[PDB]
Design a protein around this motif. Structure first.
Motif, PDB file in Angstrom:
ATOM      1  N   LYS A   1      48.481  34.840  44.354  1.00 14.51           N
ATOM      2  CA  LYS A   1      48.464  33.840  45.532  1.00 14.51           C
ATOM      3  C   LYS A   1      47.085  33.211  45.928  1.00 14.51           C
ATOM      4  CE  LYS A   1      52.881  35.974  46.681  1.00 14.51           C
ATOM      5  NZ  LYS A   1      53.322  36.955  47.991  1.00 14.51           N
ATOM      6  N   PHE A   2      46.989  32.116  46.014  1.00 17.26           N
ATOM      7  CA  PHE A   2      45.811  31.507  47.124  1.00 17.26           C
ATOM      8  C   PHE A   2      45.875  31.434  47.882  1.00 17.26           C
ATOM      9  CE2 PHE A   2      43.460  29.276  42.806  1.00 17.26           C
ATOM     10  CZ  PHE A   2      42.807  30.326  42.406  1.00 17.26           C
ATOM     11  N   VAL A   3      45.442  32.734  49.396  1.00 15.56           N
ATOM     12  CA  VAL A   3      46.346  31.468  50.599  1.00 15.56           C
ATOM     13  C   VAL A   3      45.134  31.562  50.912  1.00 15.56           C
ATOM     14  CG1 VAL A   3      48.426  33.270  50.552  1.00 15.56           C
ATOM     15  CG2 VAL A   3      46.364  34.102  51.324  1.00 15.56           C
ATOM     16  N   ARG A   4      45.123  30.351  52.085  1.00 16.42           N
ATOM     17  CA  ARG A   4      44.233  29.966  53.050  1.00 16.42           C
ATOM     18  C   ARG A   4      44.069  30.440  54.919  1.00 16.42           C
ATOM     19  NH1 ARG A   4      40.452  26.318  54.242  1.00 16.42           N
ATOM     20  NH2 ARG A   4      39.862  26.251  55.984  1.00 16.42           N
ATOM     21  N   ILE A   5      43.462  31.264  54.863  1.00 18.91           N
ATOM     22  CA  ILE A   5      43.504  32.911  56.329  1.00 18.91           C
ATOM     23  C   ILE A   5      42.960  31.869  56.907  1.00 18.91           C
ATOM     24  CG2 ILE A   5      43.897  34.583  54.625  1.00 18.91           C
ATOM     25  CD1 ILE A   5      40.533  34.947  56.089  1.00 18.91           C
ATOM     26  N   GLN A   6      44.076  32.716  58.504  1.00 23.95           N
ATOM     27  CA  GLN A   6      43.106  32.288  60.091  1.00 23.95           C
ATOM     28  C   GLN A   6      42.432  32.848  60.546  1.00 23.95           C
ATOM     29  OE1 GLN A   6      45.140  29.357  61.703  1.00 23.95           O
ATOM     30  NE2 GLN A   6      46.208  29.397  59.304  1.00 23.95           N
ATOM     31  N   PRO A   7      41.242  32.066  61.327  1.00 22.53           N
ATOM     32  CA  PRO A   7      40.077  32.533  62.344  1.00 22.53           C
ATOM     33  C   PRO A   7      41.141  34.601  63.230  1.00 22.53           C
ATOM     34  CG  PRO A   7      40.201  30.916  63.422  1.00 22.53           C
ATOM     35  CD  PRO A   7      41.347  30.818  61.732  1.00 22.53           C
ATOM     36  N   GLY A   8      40.121  35.405  62.872  1.00 19.17           N
ATOM     37  CA  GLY A   8      40.325  36.650  62.707  1.00 19.17           C
ATOM     38  C   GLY A   8      40.787  37.831  61.790  1.00 19.17           C
ATOM     39  N   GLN A   9      41.707  36.684  61.005  1.00 20.53           N
ATOM     40  CA  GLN A   9      42.027  37.806  59.706  1.00 20.53           C
ATOM     41  C   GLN A   9      41.213  38.599  58.601  1.00 20.53           C
ATOM     42  OE1 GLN A   9      45.342  34.687  58.137  1.00 20.53           O
ATOM     43  NE2 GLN A   9      46.356  36.322  58.928  1.00 20.53           N
ATOM     44  N   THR A  10      40.857  39.240  58.386  1.00 19.23           N
ATOM     45  CA  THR A  10      40.352  40.165  57.370  1.00 19.23           C
ATOM     46  C   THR A  10      40.704  40.700  56.347  1.00 19.23           C
ATOM     47  OG1 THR A  10      41.443  42.448  57.785  1.00 19.23           O
ATOM     48  CG2 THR A  10      40.114  41.911  59.917  1.00 19.23           C
ATOM     49  N   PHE A  11      39.880  40.981  54.998  1.00 13.54           N
ATOM     50  CA  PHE A  11      39.469  40.206  53.844  1.00 13.54           C
ATOM     51  C   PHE A  11      38.916  41.462  53.969  1.00 13.54           C
ATOM     52  CE2 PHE A  11      36.270  37.944  53.145  1.00 13.54           C
ATOM     53  CZ  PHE A  11      36.463  36.749  53.971  1.00 13.54           C
ATOM     54  N   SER A  12      38.961  41.836  51.883  1.00 21.25           N
ATOM     55  CA  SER A  12      37.838  42.918  51.157  1.00 21.25           C
ATOM     56  C   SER A  12      37.013  41.466  50.450  1.00 21.25           C
ATOM     57  CB  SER A  12      38.412  43.822  51.118  1.00 21.25           C
ATOM     58  OG  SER A  12      39.249  44.645  51.471  1.00 21.25           O
ATOM     59  N   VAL A  13      35.896  41.869  50.322  1.00 24.82           N
ATOM     60  CA  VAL A  13      35.186  41.009  49.373  1.00 24.82           C
ATOM     61  C   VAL A  13      34.418  42.261  48.350  1.00 24.82           C
ATOM     62  CG1 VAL A  13      32.690  39.818  49.166  1.00 24.82           C
ATOM     63  CG2 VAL A  13      34.247  39.716  51.207  1.00 24.82           C
ATOM     64  N   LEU A  14      34.745  41.750  47.748  1.00 24.04           N
ATOM     65  CA  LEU A  14      33.716  42.457  45.434  1.00 24.04           C
ATOM     66  C   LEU A  14      32.659  41.203  46.386  1.00 24.04           C
ATOM     67  CD1 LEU A  14      33.818  44.890  43.474  1.00 24.04           C
ATOM     68  CD2 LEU A  14      35.858  42.781  42.208  1.00 24.04           C
ATOM     69  N   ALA A  15      31.636  42.219  46.300  1.00 20.33           N
ATOM     70  CA  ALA A  15      30.143  41.741  45.912  1.00 20.33           C
ATOM     71  C   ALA A  15      29.617  41.228  44.385  1.00 20.33           C
ATOM     72  CB  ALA A  15      29.495  42.214  46.965  1.00 20.33           C
ATOM     73  N   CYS A  16      29.349  40.375  43.861  1.00 18.12           N
ATOM     74  CA  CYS A  16      29.104  40.451  42.914  1.00 18.12           C
ATOM     75  C   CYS A  16      27.497  40.047  42.139  1.00 18.12           C
ATOM     76  CB  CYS A  16      30.713  39.651  41.369  1.00 18.12           C
ATOM     77  SG  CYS A  16      31.797  40.728  41.565  1.00 18.12           S
ATOM     78  N   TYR A  17      27.351  39.843  41.378  1.00 20.15           N
ATOM     79  CA  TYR A  17      26.057  39.439  40.205  1.00 20.15           C
ATOM     80  C   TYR A  17      26.218  38.818  39.528  1.00 20.15           C
ATOM     81  CZ  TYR A  17      24.235  39.905  45.464  1.00 20.15           C
ATOM     82  OH  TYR A  17      24.708  40.013  47.193  1.00 20.15           O
ATOM     83  N   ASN A  18      26.000  38.092  38.305  1.00 23.12           N
ATOM     84  CA  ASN A  18      26.112  38.288  37.242  1.00 23.12           C
ATOM     85  C   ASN A  18      27.164  38.327  36.403  1.00 23.12           C
ATOM     86  OD1 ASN A  18      23.523  37.455  36.156  1.00 23.12           O
ATOM     87  ND2 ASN A  18      22.859  39.090  37.460  1.00 23.12           N
ATOM     88  N   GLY A  19      28.260  38.135  37.958  1.00 22.08           N
ATOM     89  CA  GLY A  19      29.986  38.456  36.685  1.00 22.08           C
ATOM     90  C   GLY A  19      30.253  39.672  37.123  1.00 22.08           C
ATOM     91  N   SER A  20      29.265  41.139  37.325  1.00 20.03           N
ATOM     92  CA  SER A  20      29.274  42.154  37.765  1.00 20.03           C
ATOM     93  C   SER A  20      29.296  42.162  38.891  1.00 20.03           C
ATOM     94  CB  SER A  20      27.997  43.457  36.968  1.00 20.03           C
ATOM     95  OG  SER A  20      28.219  42.650  35.694  1.00 20.03           O
TER      96      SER A  20
END
Ligand SMILES: CN(C)c1ccc(N(Cc2cc(Cl)cs2)C(=O)Cc2cncc3ccccc23)cc1
Ligand SMILES: CN(C)c1ccc(N(Cc2cc(Cl)cs2)C(=O)Cc2cncc3ccccc23)cc1
Lengths: 306, 305
Positions: free
Chosen positions: A102-121
């Motif tokens: 799903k695509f969801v727009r979060i509210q301030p205060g909500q957390t999420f995980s980031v997958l930091a990528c470079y060059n698609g990796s």
């Protein structure tokens, strides 16, 4: 026991990361079904970014100006459109690893995980909160644009963030996956600034409950407060208002620990007035606000993902 | 810019996790090729745990006493052997998701990612250091045993940790993937206690270099130190000694920033004396010691996998 900043397992998102090149600009894209999503600034040079007309820059681009690479495999672009600040590249190949999403727009205060990528990796995975000033405190170098943030519920990846920009203070700004910025930011290289930030009150209370679950109780006291009197004090300390909805969301943690939400509010009230007197909570000398109530329950109860 | 405690992407490890059940005991296993690795205490009841004889408990087992589940698929166990504190279950099916992998034993101070699992399913991923006292400060509930810790180099997963136990202080103990415990710990329910822990000095220095790379210099000073005077001071704060090897390992960060290792040691000396005086370093009000010099270079240079 123990309490760590914990990311969602990244595997379902790792299978969605691609490299997008337009001219001399390379960044990351998110490959779901037969569409690649990336920042629309992929079509800009550094010179264009000073004053881009995205409509005009895009109309000059053909499908073959966009090079999409999924690992070793070249995906052919067969169509392109912009949605707000995201470019959608239609490709000849549906991603066979596309998760339930799903695509969801979060509210301030909500957390999420980031997958930091470079060059698609992928480089790595960490947790972020959407700050009240709509920035995140990330770790992003040039080339990280198009890295995403996400939550998992069971087998459903909820994508909530795509990375676009670093502000002068070294904090980060981006969009939802429909290309709508979090915060009053634009995808132009112009003078822009993080606003004054505030502390995410409901999250500090969640983390105090995490502290109690983990055997740290020194800050509990015999006092209570009304919601109103709590907010009158906390607002002096640049804390977000606590709503009845925040109180309701803390119900499960209150029930697990036997500490009434307004009693934990009284503890926090005293902490803001007195400080810690050289003591720590969960190994921190600061009140941490980047754990949601759900983050605490998920970590303290061992919720898994299939 | 920015600097965060960052885990390795967990995908390659997620594809290796299974559920292992023996009688009433369920925990996690690691499925590589046609072997499942798990804590040998999967063969214990709570009653067995005070002084178990694992040779005696194991010889009593048949292959069909071990239920291995990879999602919906039952894997058939066709053999088992014990290597130190790990059980190796030979299964009839090689894991098609087996990554390029190595088993490594790490040193105290070294970091790794943990994929916390319950019932063979991942809960989450975080970064840990092997403490000087051979514990880790993890987040593990009952059922997490057999969760693994690992590093990635490009496409090669180096497994370094398998989870066995929580100590009374709420810190954690386990083995390498050859079943040798980190530290003096044993897989018995006997009184065992984490020794006094110390701060991983070489990592604190790495993280100060991370802070400089990220545009923060407030904590630097005009001073230097001998290595010996540094160690005399830092040991009074329960810091690990800094060796010439640690100094050599900090060379690349020293060269990138133009700050001599011993100059950064002088800054750390003053930080221990003064504290932060209401400031933070990379968002922390304490001196962080769970980033290695390699972790800093990796994160500040955008190494991918
Ligand atoms: C050449 N291109 C395409 C280009 C695209 C984006 C950027 N910028 C500046 C801006 C982004 C936005 Cl949105 C408005 S201004 C960034 O902020 C990118 C960026 C993102 N995240 C960490 C960064 C760290 C260092 C430098 C740039 C970073 C510059 C050039
Ligand atoms: C019933 N079984 C098999 C069994 C196996 C292990 C455990 N223990 C105690 C011990 C482990 C070891 Cl090694 C020696 S004593 C644990 O520490 C498991 C454990 C691991 N990690 C977080 C825990 C948190 C709470 C409770 C137990 C946890 C208990 C029963």
């Amino acid at each position: 026991s123990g309490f760590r900043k914990m990311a969602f397992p990244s595997g379902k998102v790792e299978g969605c990361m691609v490299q997008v090149t337009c001219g001399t600009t390379t960044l990351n894209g998110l490959w779901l079904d037969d569409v690649v999503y990336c920042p629309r600034h992929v079509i800009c040079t550094s010179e264009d970014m000073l004053n881009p007309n995205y409509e005009d820059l895009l109309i000059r681009k053909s499908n073959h100006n966009f090079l999409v690479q999924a690992g070793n495999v070249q995906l052919r672009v067969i169509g392109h459109s912009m949605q707000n600040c995201v470019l959608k590249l239609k490709v000849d190949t549906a991603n066979p690893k596309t998760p339930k999403y799903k695509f969801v727009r979060i509210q301030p205060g909500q957390t999420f995980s980031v997958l930091a990528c470079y060059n698609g990796s992928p480089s790595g995975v960490y947790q972020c909160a959407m700050r009240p000033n709509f920035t995140i405190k990330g770790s992003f170098l040039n080339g990280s644009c198009g890295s995403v943030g996400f939550n998992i519920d069971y087998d459903c990846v909820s994508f909530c963030y795509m990375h676009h920009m670093e502000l002068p203070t070294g904090v980060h700004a981006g969009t939802d996956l429909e290309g709508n910025f979090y915060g009053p930011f634009v995808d132009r290289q112009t003078a822009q600034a993080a606003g004054t930030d505030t502390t995410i009150t409901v999250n500090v209370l969640a983390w105090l409950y995490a502290a109690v679950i983990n055997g740290d109780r020194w800050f509990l006291n015999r006092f209570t407060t009304t919601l109103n009197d709590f907010n009158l004090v906390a607002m002096k300390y640049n804390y977000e208002p606590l709503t009845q909805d925040h109180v309701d969301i803390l119900g499960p943690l209150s029930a697990q620990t036997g500490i009434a939400v307004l009693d934990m509010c009284a503890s926090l009230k005293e902490l803001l007035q007195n400080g810690m007197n050289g003591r720590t909570i969960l190994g921190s000398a600061l009140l941490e606000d980047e754990f949601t109530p759900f983050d605490v329950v998920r970590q303290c109860s061992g919720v898994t993902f299939q």
